[PDB]
Amino acid sequence: SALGKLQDVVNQNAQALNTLVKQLSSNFGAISSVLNDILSRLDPPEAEV
Amino acid sequence: ASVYAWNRKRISNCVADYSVLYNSASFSTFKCYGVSPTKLNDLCFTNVYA
Numbered sequence: 001s002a003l004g005k006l007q008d009v010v011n012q013n014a015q016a017l018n019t020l021v022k023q024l025s026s027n028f029g030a031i032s033s034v035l036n037d038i039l040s041r042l043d044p045p046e047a048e049v
Numbered sequence: 050a051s052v053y054a055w056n057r058k059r060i061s062n063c064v065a066d067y068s069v070l071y072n073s074a075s076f077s078t079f080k081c082y083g084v085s086p087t088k089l090n091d092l093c094f095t096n097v098y099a
Contacts, residue, residue, distance in 0.1 A: 042084070
């Protein structure tokens with residue numbers, strides 16, 4: 001644990017990137033989190049929503 | 050069937066042409082939920098029940 005100050009910065013940046021990548025898996029209230037599924041399932045008036 | 054004893058049929062292992070159903074003028078009500086009616090031929094389905 002001698003080099004913990006640099007490893008803390010590395011871990012924080014990697015965890016922020018992992019959270020940003022993980023946020024793509026959330027649908028945020030939509031029917032699906034995948035854009036291609038919505039574009040292949042729905043007409044553009046409701047796929048727009 | 051009657052509505053209290055509604056019949057359920059499994060649809061599986063076949064190719065479904067929904068363009069001859071949706072373009073038919075025989076059906077007064079055609080309401081699709083969660084899928085567009087014109088996108089039906091472009092999708093493949095599992096566990097189809099009628």
